[PDB]
Every structure is written in C-alpha cells, then in structure tokens.
C-alpha cells in the first residue's frame, strides 16, 4: 500500500546515500588541492627567469664563439 | 513502526546534511584538470626549451 | 502524521538527486594525487636540468 512505497522510496535514498558516502570519501582521499598546486606554480615562476637568463647567457657565448 | 521510519529519514537527512558540508570543503579546495594541464603546459614548454639549450652548450664545448 | 513524513521523504530526494548530480561533476574536474605527483616530478627534473646547464654555462664562461 501507501506505506509500503514510502518504505520502497526510503530505500532506494537508503542505498544513494550509501554510495554518495563513498563516493565523497574517495575524492577527498585522492584530491590535489589548490594550495599544493600554487606551491608548484611558486617554483615554476622561479625556473621561467632562470631559463631566460640562460638563453640570454647562451646567445652571448655564441656571438662571441663567433668571431 | 512509522516512528522508526520518520527516524530512518532524520538519520538520512543528517547524512545528506554532512555530505552537503563536505562537497562545498572539497571544491574550495579542489584543483582542477584545467588548471593543471595549464601548469604541466608550462613545465613542457620549459622543458622543451632546456633541451634546446643543452643541445645548443654541447656545440659550443666541442668548439671550444 | 503522514504528511510530516511525506514531506521529509521529499526534502531528501530532491536534497540527494542534487548531490548525485554535484559529485558526478566533480569526479569530472578534480585533479588527484598521483596527477600532482607527476608533475611535481616534472618540474624535478626542470629544476635539475636548469641547474646543471647554470654550471655548465658558467664553466663554458671561465673557458672563453
Ligand atoms: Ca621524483
Ligand atoms: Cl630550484
């Protein structure tokens, strides 16, 4: 009857929330945060400048490999 | 007996409340593939330019 | 009675079919772990390979 769907509705939620638990607790599990990427954007800044000064040192030492 | 339900569904929407709470935590938090890939992009590039470079001092120390 | 349970019953479907729909998008957006640490592997070797050629320039330097 009327209280037995509302028993069968209760369940099938029964069950979503089990599998949304389980689901929430794996992705914190296995999340990158926002903050460990910015650690490497940090270093990423760092190495951009050392990589042009680099090119700016290896054109010179051409040029003057050059004559 | 429908005490015992009303009480199954408080239970779940204490859960739900939780998971609710838990879900906004996680994308305050979250990276993401766009933003990552963005990152790895750079590190690519930079790579690719290192490689170059290394290639480009090797000539130069066999001229030398 | 059975209404105040009815309507509690509602407030949790539709509170779960919204929280059904939020983690499958976030499964799709979330960067993970081993991701992080692959490109923090990447930018290891970055790191390494700019410092090395730093040496190797400045050696080159003294020699010309
Ligand atoms: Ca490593
Ligand atoms: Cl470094």
């Given at each position: 009857?009327?209280?037995?769907?509302?028993?069968?509705?209760?369940?099938?939620?029964?069950?979503?929330?089990?599998?949304?638990?389980?689901?929430?607790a794996?992705?914190?599990?296995?999340m990158?945060?926002?903050?460990?990427?910015?650690?490497?954007?940090?270093?990423?800044?760092?190495?951009?400048?050392?990589?042009?000064?680099?090119?700016?040192?290896?054109?010179?030492?051409?040029?003057?490999?050059?004559?």
């Amino acid at each position: 009857g009327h209280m037995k769907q509302l028993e069968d509705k209760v369940e099938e939620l029964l069950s979503k929330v089990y599998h949304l638990e389980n689901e929430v607790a794996r992705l914190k599990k296995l999340m990158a945060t926002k903050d460990d990427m910015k650690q490497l954007e940090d270093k990423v800044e760092e190495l951009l400048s050392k990589v042009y000064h680099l090119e700016n040192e290896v054109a010179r030492l051409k040029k003057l490999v050059g004559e």
